[PDB]
Amino acid sequence: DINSPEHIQRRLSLQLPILHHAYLPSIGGVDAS
Amino acid sequence: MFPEVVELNVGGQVYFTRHSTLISIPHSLLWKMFSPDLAKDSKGRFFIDRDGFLFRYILDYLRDRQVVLPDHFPEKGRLKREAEYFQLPDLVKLLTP
Amino acid sequence: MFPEVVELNVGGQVYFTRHSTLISIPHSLLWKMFSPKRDDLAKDSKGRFFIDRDGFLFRYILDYLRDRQVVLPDHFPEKGRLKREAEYFQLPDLVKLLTP
Amino acid sequence: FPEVVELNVGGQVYFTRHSTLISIPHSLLWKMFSPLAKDSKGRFFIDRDGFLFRYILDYLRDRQVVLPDHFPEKGRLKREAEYFQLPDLVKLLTP
Amino acid sequence: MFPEVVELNVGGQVYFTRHSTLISIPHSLLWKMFSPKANDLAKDSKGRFFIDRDGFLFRYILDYLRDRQVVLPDHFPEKGRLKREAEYFQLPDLVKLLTP
Amino acid sequence: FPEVVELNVGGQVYFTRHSTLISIPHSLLWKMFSPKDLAKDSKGRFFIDRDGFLFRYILDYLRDRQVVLPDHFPEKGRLKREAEYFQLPDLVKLLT
Ligand SMILES: [Mg+2]
């Protein structure tokens, strides 16, 4: 199936460098609430 | 069958949009997907394996039935390819010289 | 009755701003949504108010609502698109500022 | 106020000490945290651009700010410095 | 009396690392902070140790403490800023690597 | 070891099957998790003292012995260094 463990967990979403995000930091570690 | 606000993942970029926006153009690819078995990502958002940067414009065309390109956009041919994949005939002609 | 801090979701980009900022410009689109008492707006799964527009361009729309002015980044490649977003939200003065 | 202040600036979450916010008298952050609106999680809320607050917060710490190499938003950061009323930081940003 | 794995909060960015890693550089600021000589150090709402510094750049500080070297991203705009963080944490050799 | 091991890498929690960690013989994670010291956090999760974000692509390699990265990956050099720590010889070759 298209939805399967190895298939589902492959699709990791990350923030593409669109506009300001291209030059502003996005990854520093885990977020705090 | 679908919520009012749909969670989309296009090439790794998360997008939120109304269900009405996806079906705004009948007989289109996005219309065929969400018209009353789909692919979903790790977090449960519907997944589209296409260019994440170019999907912004494609999604805006569904909103307004028109699209303003960025200033000095020389990748129009590339945006045309995405328009063909999503099956938006009128947008393809707007991008075709 | 609205909270002092409004949680917005614009096209998948989450923004926080004060209720006073949304109604800062009368007769605007955001003013219509947040000014009267309603019993109806569109919200996502987490309860955040949803605007079905480009989330990245909302950064500059929201900054205009705060200051009635907007400094763009150096070499901003989407001045023309931001004007279209300003027109949708019905901000006449901001559209004027963006027209050369 | 606690020793570690939990801030929410326009949707960007920042932690800093209470002493850091009030380090510069008669600035806006000084007026706010000198003996308020809070978000859903109880964090103190600043209604400004969250991405630029990182450089405002770095100024309060060191009284100087090294910007990234080709930082496209010096003019925008100056506007944030003016809002928070940081005269010396505004001086550093004008040529 | 610190645990083997320390929970760090740097400007709102949460970090986990081994306690031995924090004292890897003698006479450094992190050396002065976590050297047993643990309830007096400032903590956040959840009890995690708090560092009042830039959270995004601290990611690369921990790689230096681990490896005695730091591979930066292919395109990096903040080498000068990281050097300032290295100076604050008192890492002389890391400042040398970042100074051209 | 349980069927699903809970790992803490630099503060980022990951869930994975024991079989994935031991998929590559003579690897660092293989030496750690081969049924035959370890450090756990406050919640009893095994701790790896490395950068948490880059472990995502190392974990995809351990599963499939392959990794398709995005077209604009800004930290190829760092992932090469992280692969070196976990001792994945074929993966480091792929990035060179
Ligand atoms: Mg794989």
Question: Residue B78's CB: how many other CB atoms inside 10 A?
Answer: 14
CB contact under 8 A, E14 and A32: yes
Could you give the CA distance from residue D48 to residue D58 in angstroms, rounded to a whole number? 16
Could you give the CA distance from residue A19 to residue A22 in angstroms, rounded to a whole number? 6
Against chain D, the chains showing at least 3 CB pairs within 8 Å are A, C, E
Name every residue whose Cβ is closer than 8 Å to that of residue D47 and which is 6 or more positions away in sequence.
C5, C16, C17, C18, C21, C66, D10
Could you give the CA distance from residue E15 to residue E6 in angstroms, rounded to a whole number? 8
Distance, CA F24 to ligand 1 centroid (Å)?
13
Q: Which helix (H) or strand (E) holds C6?
A: strand C5-10
Smallest CA-to-CA distance from C86 within C12, C18, C30, C43 is with C30
Chains A and D share 3 or more Cβ pairs within 8 Å: yes
Could you give the CA distance from residue F39 to residue E17 in angstroms, rounded to a whole number? 11
CB contact under 8 A, A18 and C59: no
**DSSP tag of C74:** T
Rounded to the nearest 5°, which phi and psi values hold at B18? -75, 150
- The answer to whether C54 and D55 have CB atoms below 8 angstroms apart is no
In chain D, the residue whose alpha carbon lies closest to the alpha carbon of E14 is D15
- The answer to whether E62 and E5 have CB atoms below 8 angstroms apart is no
Could you give the CA distance from residue E37 to residue C90 in angstroms, rounded to a whole number? 63
- What's the Cα-to-Cα distance from F4 to each of B12, C45, D55, F7, rounded to whole Å? 26, 29, 42, 10
* Amino acid residing at F94: L
Could you give the CA distance from residue C90 to residue C61 in angstroms, rounded to a whole number? 11
For chain D, the straight-line distance linking the first and the last C-alpha, in angstroms and rounded, comes to 38
- Per DSSP, the residues of F15-31 read EEEHHHHTSSTT-HHHH
- Tally the residues of chain D: 95
Distance, CA F87 to ligand 1 centroid (Å)?
17
E-assigned strand segments in chain B:
5-10, 13-18, 46-48
Smallest CA-to-CA distance from F58 within F33, F95, F26, F25 is with F95
In chain C, the residue whose alpha carbon lies closest to the alpha carbon of A19 is C56
Chains B and A share 3 or more Cβ pairs within 8 Å: yes
Residue from A2, A3, A16 to probe the interface with B (highest B Cβ count within 10 Å): A16
Smallest CA-to-CA distance from C65 within C28, C10, C14 is with C28
Q: Which helix (H) or strand (E) holds D32?
A: helix D28-33
Smallest CA-to-CA distance from F75 within E78, A29, E73, E77 is with E73
Token representation of residue D80: 């944030």
Distance, CA F57 to ligand 1 centroid (Å)?
8
Q: For residue A19, give the 3-state DSSP assignment.
A: helix
Angle CA F13–A25–D6, to nearest 5? 70
Angle between helices E79-88 and E55-67 in degrees, nearest 10:
70
Given CB atoms, is B31 within the 8 Å cutoff of chain A?
no
CATH number at residue F61: 3.30.710.10
Could you give the CA distance from residue C6 to residue A22 in angstroms, rounded to a whole number? 27
Helix, strand, coil percent content, chain A, rounded in steps of 5: 25, 5, 70
Give the 3-state secondary structure of F44-62: CCEEECCCCCCHHHHHHHH
Given CB atoms, is A16 within the 8 Å cutoff of chain C?
no
Could you give the CA distance from residue C39 to residue D42 in angstroms, rounded to a whole number? 27
Could you give the CA distance from residue B15 to residue E10 in angstroms, rounded to a whole number? 30
The range of the structural domain enclosing residue D20 comes to 1-95
- The answer to whether D38 and D45 have CB atoms below 8 angstroms apart is yes
- Tally the residues of chain B: 97
- What's the Cα-to-Cα distance from B27 to each of B15, B63, B84, rounded to whole Å? 22, 16, 13
**DSSP tag of B77:** H
Chains A and C share 3 or more Cβ pairs within 8 Å: yes
Could you give the CA distance from residue C60 to residue C72 in angstroms, rounded to a whole number? 8
- CB contacts, 8 Å: A29 with chain E: 10, 13-15, 55, 58-59
Could you give the CA distance from residue D68 to residue D87 in angstroms, rounded to a whole number? 21
Q: For residue F6, give the 3-state DSSP assignment.
A: strand
Torsion over CA of F14, F18, F20 and F23, rounded to 10 degrees?
150
E-assigned strand segments in chain D:
4-9, 12-17, 44-46
Elucidation method: X-ray
Residue from F8, F49, F53, F72 to probe the interface with A (highest A Cβ count within 10 Å): F53
Which residues from C are below 8 Å from D when comparing CB atoms? Answer: 3-5, 7, 14-18, 21, 59, 62-63, 66-67, 69, 71-75
Give the total number of structural domains in chain B: 1
Could you give the CA distance from residue F15 to residue D60 in angstroms, rounded to a whole number? 39
- CB contacts, 8 Å: D54 with chain A: 25
Given CB atoms, is A27 within the 8 Å cutoff of chain E?
yes
CB burial of residue D6 (10 Å; 0-12, 13-18, 19+): buried
Specified resolution (Å): 3.2
Could you give the CA distance from residue A2 to residue C57 in angstroms, rounded to a whole number? 34
* Residue reference for tokens 């002015």: C69
- The answer to whether E9 and E51 have CB atoms below 8 angstroms apart is yes
Could you give the CA distance from residue B5 to residue C51 in angstroms, rounded to a whole number? 10
Given CB atoms, is A18 within the 8 Å cutoff of chain B?
yes
Rounded to the nearest 5°, which phi and psi values hold at F30? -65, -45
Helices (runs of H) and strands (runs of E) counted in chain C: 5, 3
Distance, CA F63 to ligand 1 centroid (Å)?
5
For chain F, the straight-line distance linking the first and the last C-alpha, in angstroms and rounded, comes to 34
* Residue reference for tokens 């830039």: E54
**C38: Cα separation from own chain's centroid:** 19
- The answer to whether A24 and F5 have CB atoms below 8 angstroms apart is no
**DSSP tag of D75:** H
Angle CA A13–B8–C41, to nearest 5? 125
- The answer to whether C94 and C86 have CB atoms below 8 angstroms apart is yes
E-assigned strand segments in chain A:
30-31
* Residue reference for tokens 């792929």: F94
CB contact under 8 A, D41 and A24: no
- The answer to whether D7 and E2 have CB atoms below 8 angstroms apart is no
Q: In Å, how far is E64's CA from the nearest CA of chain D?
A: 20
CB contact under 8 A, E5 and F39: yes
Smallest CA-to-CA distance from C59 within C4, C100, C3, C10 is with C10
Could you give the CA distance from residue F40 to residue F7 in angstroms, rounded to a whole number? 9
Question: Residue D30's CB: how many other CB atoms inside 10 A?
Answer: 17
